[PDB]
Amino acid sequence: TDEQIAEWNSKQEELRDKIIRSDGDFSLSKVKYVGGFDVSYSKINHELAVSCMVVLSYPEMKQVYMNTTKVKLSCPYKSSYLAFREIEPFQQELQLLKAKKPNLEPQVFLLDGNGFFHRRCGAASHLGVLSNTRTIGVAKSLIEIPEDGVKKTEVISQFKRLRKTGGNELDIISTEKNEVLAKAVLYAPKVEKPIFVSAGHKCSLETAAKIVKGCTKTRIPEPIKMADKWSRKELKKIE
Amino acid sequence: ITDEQIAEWNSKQEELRDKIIRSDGDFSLSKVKYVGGFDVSYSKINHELAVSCMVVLSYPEMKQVYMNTTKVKLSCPYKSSYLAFREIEPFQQELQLLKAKKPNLEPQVFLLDGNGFFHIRRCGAASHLGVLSNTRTIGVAKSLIEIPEDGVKKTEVISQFKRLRKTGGNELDIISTEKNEVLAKAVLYAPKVEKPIFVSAGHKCSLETAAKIVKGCTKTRIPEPIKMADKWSRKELKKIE
Ligand SMILES: [Ca+2]
Ligand SMILES: [Ca+2]
Ligand SMILES: [Ca+2]
Ligand SMILES: [Ca+2]
Numbered sequence: 001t002d003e004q005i006a007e008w009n010s011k012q013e014e015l016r017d018k019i020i021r022s023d024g025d026f027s028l029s030k031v032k033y034v035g036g037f038d039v040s041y042s043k044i045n046h047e048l049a050v051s052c053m054v055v056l057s058y059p060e061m062k063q064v065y066m067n068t069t070k071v072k073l074s075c076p077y078k079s080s081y082l083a084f085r086e087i088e089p090f091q092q093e094l095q096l097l098k099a100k101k102p103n104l105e106p107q108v109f110l111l112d113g114n115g116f117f118h119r120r121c122g123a124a125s126h127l128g129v130l131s132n133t134r135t136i137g138v139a140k141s142l143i144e145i146p147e148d149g150v151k152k153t154e155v156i157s158q159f160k161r162l163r164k165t166g167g168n169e170l171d172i173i174s175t176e177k178n179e180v181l182a183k184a185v186l187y188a189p190k191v192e193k194p195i196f197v198s199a200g201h202k203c204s205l206e207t208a209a210k211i212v213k214g215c216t217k218t219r220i221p222e223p224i225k226m227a228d229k230w231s232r233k234e235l236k237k238i239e
Numbered sequence: 240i241t242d243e244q245i246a247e248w249n250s251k252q253e254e255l256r257d258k259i260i261r262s263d264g265d266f267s268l269s270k271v272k273y274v275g276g277f278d279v280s281y282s283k284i285n286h287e288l289a290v291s292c293m294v295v296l297s298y299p300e301m302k303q304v305y306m307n308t309t310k311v312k313l314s315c316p317y318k319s320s321y322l323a324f325r326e327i328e329p330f331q332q333e334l335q336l337l338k339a340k341k342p343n344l345e346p347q348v349f350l351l352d353g354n355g356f357f358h359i360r361r362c363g364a365a366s367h368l369g370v371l372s373n374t375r376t377i378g379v380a381k382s383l384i385e386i387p388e389d390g391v392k393k394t395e396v397i398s399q400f401k402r403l404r405k406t407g408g409n410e411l412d413i414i415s416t417e418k419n420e421v422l423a424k425a426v427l428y429a430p431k432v433e434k435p436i437f438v439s440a441g442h443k444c445s446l447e448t449a450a451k452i453v454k455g456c457t458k459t460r461i462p463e464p465i466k467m468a469d470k471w472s473r474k475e476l477k478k479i480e
Contacts, residue, residue, distance in 0.1 A: 192466070236474075236477050236478075237477070
């Protein structure tokens with residue numbers, strides 16, 4: 001329904017002004033634990049899914065916490081509105097972590113999707129402000145926003161050109177307002193497809209890229225890899 | 240593994256070696272109304288837990304008409320050239336269950352993971368399972384077995400198939416240089432595919448007829464009967480981890 005998107009855009013604007021894109025008292029030296037969160041959905045069951053939240057030790061990337069919970073969905077997926085799908089499983093998993101093992105609450109969270117790379121209010125930023133936690137947006141594919149002058153063919157063209165120069169990080173700039181939206185980064189060996197890091201909450205883009213680089217073993221950062229792994233495994237355990 | 244076990248297995252493969260029929264006889268492709276597949280999926284966390292799956296598909300439409308999965312207890316580890324002893328017992332249990340529950344869907348031929356005649360003692364798992372069950376089988380391997388005693392080296396076969404692919408071909412005879420007998424055909428029947436699969440005669444079927452059946456069973460690189468059995472066996476296995 002179009003009524004639902006009309007309230008969602010107003011929801012994106014109210015939280016737009018709330019997202020903090022500065023580190024403040026936070027720094028890379030403060031990072032002792034980094035958390036990951038992912039949701040796996042069932043193709044055979046339209047409303048059944050499994051959420052998973054993990055905590056890994058920084059920078060050794062040793063998994064120290066993992067919990068998986070069966071989830072009931074009330075929202076379908078729509079581009080630029082990913083936040084509303086996973087906000088409740090994230091809040092549910094976050095509370096179980098603070099209750100079961102409160103010492104393992106990580107300094108920062110890695111979330112699937114973008115944050116500032118969005119109405120400037122991606123799911124990573126949306127979940128961060130509503131939960132009062134430090135989040136980083138990491139997307140495996142490029143969101144396209146023609147309203148900001150970013151297109152997929154141009155980003156991959158200048159990135160492949162940047163690759164010819166020998167680089168590995170490329171600022172993705174909004175053609176309007178001249179704002180850096182995300183960094184197309186490549187921190188893993190034997191990888192050519194870039195991931196897109198964007199600021200989530202209580203953290204800057206430049207610092208977020210460093211944290212993602214520390215979490216990088218293969219193309220997918222370890223916190224996202226583990227959360228993706230266990231969520232899918234448990235979903236196929238209850239079919 | 241034990242050396243008495245390897246010596247006892249070699250005598251069993253030699254006993255069965257000459258009992259494999261690689262001729263069509265009164266068999267033809269037109270007779271194939273159903274084609275069966277069989278695969279076993281194993282658990283890495285449990286050394287003795289596995290799930291066997293047998294499926295039957297309509298030929299040539301490749302529509303699944305039968306599927307069963309059974310929990311399996313293993314009494315054998317995997318060793319190359321001895322796959323038969325690993326999967327012989329679950330296959331006969333699956334064949335017995337199919338012949339008992341729905342005997343009208345018993346297929347004319349089975350597609351089995353691994354080789355048949357393409358074997359060091361000419362008694363692969365497809366042939367071994369075929370003769371010990373009195374069923375028509377075809378050996379289909381996803382990777383190339385190397386037999387140095389027959390002059391089969393992987394680098395020379397894949398390079399020879401690479402040149403044939405550039406010429407435009409799709410079938411390559413794999414010949415034992417020592418015996419001058421064709422052991423298998425490296426075939427490529429799927430679009431957007433360059434890595435070949437290796438079809439070899441199993442039992443009660445010729446090599447060329449087996450290749451025709453595999454071509455009819457080809458949708459993607461993996462033939463549909465093997466694809467379905469592989470899929471359902473692993474899916475059911477992941478329910479018991
Ligand atoms: Ca996700
Ligand atoms: Ca996922
Ligand atoms: Ca197998
Ligand atoms: Ca398999």
